[PDB]
Design a protein around this ligand. Structure first.
Ligand SMILES: C=CC1=C(C)c2cc3[nH]c(cc4nc(cc5[nH]c(cc1n2)c(C)c5C=C)C(C)=C4CCC(=O)O)c(CCC(=O)O)c3C
Ligand SMILES: C=CC1=C(C)c2cc3[nH]c(cc4nc(cc5[nH]c(cc1n2)c(C)c5C=C)C(C)=C4CCC(=O)O)c(CCC(=O)O)c3C
Ligand SMILES: C=CC1=C(C)c2cc3[nH]c(cc4nc(cc5[nH]c(cc1n2)c(C)c5C=C)C(C)=C4CCC(=O)O)c(CCC(=O)O)c3C
Ligand SMILES: C[C@H](CCC(=O)O)[C@H]1CC[C@H]2[C@@H]3[C@H](O)C[C@@H]4C[C@H](O)CC[C@]4(C)[C@H]3C[C@H](O)[C@]12C
Ligand code: FES
Ligand code: FES
Lengths: 359, 359
């Protein structure tokens, strides 16, 4: 049966092998939508080269590359299975991987979907909380694909641009948080502090009205209500890059400060991620949970596991897509409003791409 | 009768008359728990003297002083009338105004609470969203009072240190927002952008792990979930003072930014206050809505009205107190954990003068 409905899963993607680090970093640092940089065209290549070495080593420490693709596939296939059931009308569903900086690119995926004669195309961001640096960059990519070529899509487009508090996403974290707590020494459980560690963002993005911080906070809030405040929690931000100011307490300094102030049982939560990768397997698990945990004298530092293959997460993907169709909305109401202090001409256009759509 | 259970309402307070402005600012800029200033004891006076004229003028423009006490008084009586009924066992209830920088200072209030020979003393913060700079400072005052008076309290203390998503608090905002929308043209209603304007915080306080940011967001989410995303929204921050970096997008820049980008139908919302005062009557109402929107060339820019005398608000107060008394809680789980990068010796001590309470 010809693929009828296509769900394009968008995420950043990551180096599969150490040989893919450099090219990945070059594209990444060249992307002005992720973050603005002085003379990006020239600085990026410079940054990519100097950085490739240590990043390659990091990828070696965790296998030789990022698992993001494998996790994304497993998730989509499960999704399709359920879609091909919940919504029998939308005939066969086919998932498509659209990584921002690694072939399977967004452009290769669009080309591919068009080549399948799909009548429906759904841009489904894998970033639950919206940032103009992530979903906004993946979306502009979709828009640009058509703009540059100068042709209109042969399919109907719609987009699930965000899903901060999907009740099934929330249940996954809460659940994962309960089996972790269950493995801390019983007499130390109620002392464990829960650190939600969301990727951080330059203050240049946050200060321009970016939606991200608020929604991550929303995700954080739902989870804790679901766990009915069983433990103290704090929202911290990780993975800062470069000299410029970035948001809220860094996770590293937070784990350190807690440790030095009496709180030595910490539970980390990948609140803004959907699978394992360098950010968890190496940064949180090795850098903080091993090295930093050791230097400060942590009694127990554990990490709630990543959604990854959790069927309940697949359940959630499909449910979101299903509700999406049923609703016939072209995008979320929030998307129809660009950042208060936006200065990216593409944004306003990418917005039309989905709002000014038919069917 | 004679009070049995005392509800000490905590808020910053405000200059009742133009004559009270100078010393109000001196106290405020000296309070290191609010925000830290270089050579504080020297700078505070300078700042206060230089800032007074401008601020007296602002009060003049809105009545010659602040409403905060009147408002707080009415909310308290309403809370009392309900508490004396919802929870008769807690017998007579008396509310005391505990203003951080002006008369019924936290100390004076504690003083007459003790004198009224109460049995139960409850610290009820009028800051729905917890920040060390606000509730944190007010709580620190309660602690420093006894510790300075050199005597043990003659009544059981407990605290309601935060209530960011209390069901009824959300119903007042959601409601006020709806009737404000009704004053907008009908074929624009859904085009109106809702700007939840909270008081901003210095990054110095945010980067230390302050609960406020994430907490304020949690309120926004609830409000919008209740309004089932009828309109586009953005959480921005107002009231920065001084040269140092402060949090997120400024309400002003956000307003002017929306105009220049076309969105000229705006609804402001005091998501962190519980009554009107200089932050709304003057800043939002005259400085942005009038003066700023003037130039900007805006359609309609209105503001939901402050909670003030809303009966539902008194219910919220009463429902929180009563619910607090039943839970037999001494404070929130969140208060039992100080900031990850906390460097204030008082904090730790304040957490004791609440968690080490009888009954
Ligand atoms: C504008 C601010 C951001 C910058 C500058 C940024 C930078 C990076 N993000 C990377 C990888 C990544 N970033 C990722 C999700 C996010 N990244 C985010 C925001 C940013 N991410 C946000 C927000 C994300 C979602 C919550 C993912 C998923 C990877 C890939 C991990 C992998 O597969 O190994 C890498 C490669 C790592 C390294 O240390 O060299 C950089 C440099
Ligand atoms: C370090 C961060 C903060 C600073 C430096 C701060 C400064 C002030 N807050 C004031 C008044 C006030 N601030 C107030 C609630 C808050 N203020 C807050 C955070 C701060 N508030 C937060 C957070 C609040 C609650 C969400 C209130 C209620 C007033 C009283 C206004 C009145 O009654 O007229 C005034 C006097 C007004 C003026 O503009 O000169 C200053 C200088
Ligand atoms: C954060 C640490 C601060 C530093 C390093 C600081 C530095 C300065 N503040 C100045 C002036 C001033 N600072 C002032 C209010 C504040 N200043 C503040 C915080 C600081 N202010 C805060 C907080 C204020 C409250 C709003 C005022 C009112 C002036 C007067 C400027 C003038 O017109 O001369 C000047 C000198 C201006 C000149 O041209 O003579 C300096 C160098
Ligand atoms: C922020 C404050 C205005 C008071 C207010 O908020 O109304 C203004 C008044 C004087 C200003 C300062 C003075 O112009 C002196 C300095 C000039 C430098 O170019 C920036 C820092 C510098 C140290 C300024 C920081 C800040 O813009 C100040 C302190
Ligand atoms: S940067 Fe957010 S809409 Fe343009
Ligand atoms: S500053 Fe927050 S607990 Fe000390």
């Amino acid at each position: 049966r010809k693929p009828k409905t296509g769900i394009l899963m968008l995420n950043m993607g990551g180096p599969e092998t150490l040989g893919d680090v450099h090219d990945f970093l070059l594209r990444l640092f060249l992307d002005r939508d992720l973050m603005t940089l002085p003379i990006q065209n020239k600085l990026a290549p410079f940054i990519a080269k100097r950085r490739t070495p240590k990043i390659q080593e990091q990828y070696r420490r965790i296998g030789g590359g990022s698992p993001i693709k494998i996790w994304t596939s497993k998730q989509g296939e499960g999704m399709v299975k359920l879609l091909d059931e919940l919504s029998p009308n939308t005939a066969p569903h086919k998932y498509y991987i659209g990584f921002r900086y690694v072939h399977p690119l967004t452009e290769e995926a669009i080309e591919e979907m068009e080549r399948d004669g799909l009548e429906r195309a759904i841009a489904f961001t894998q970033y639950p909380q919206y940032s103009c640096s992530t979903t906004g960059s993946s979306l502009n990519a979709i828009y640009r694909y058509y703009n540059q070529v100068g042709r209109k899509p042969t399919m109907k487009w719609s987009t699930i641009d965000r899903w901060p508090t999907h009740h099934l996403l929330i249940q996954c974290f809460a659940d994962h948080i309960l089996k972790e707590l269950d493995h801390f020494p019983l007499e130390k459980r109620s002392e464990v502090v829960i650190l939600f560690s969301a990727h951080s963002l330059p203050m240049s993005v946050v200060n321009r009205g970016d939606p991200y911080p608020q929604e991550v906070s929303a995700t954080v809030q739902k989870v804790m209500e679901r766990l009915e405040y069983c433990n103290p929690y704090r929202l911290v931000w990780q993975s800062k890059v470069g000299p410029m100011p970035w948001l809220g307490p860094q996770t590293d300094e937070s784990i350190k400060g807690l440790c030095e102030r009496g709180r030595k049982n910490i539970l980390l939560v990948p609140i803004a991620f959907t699978s394992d990768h360098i950010k968890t397997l190496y940064e949180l698990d090795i850098e903080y949970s091993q090295v930093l945990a050791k230097e400060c004298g942590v009694e127990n530092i554990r990490r709630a596991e990543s959604l990854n293959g959790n069927p309940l997460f697949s359940k959630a993907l499909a449910d979101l897509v299903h509700s999406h169709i049923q609703s016939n909305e072209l995008c979320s109401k929030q998307l129809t409003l660009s950042c208060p202090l936006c200065v990216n001409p593409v944004c306003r256009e990418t917005k039309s791409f989905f709002t000014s759509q038919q069917l």
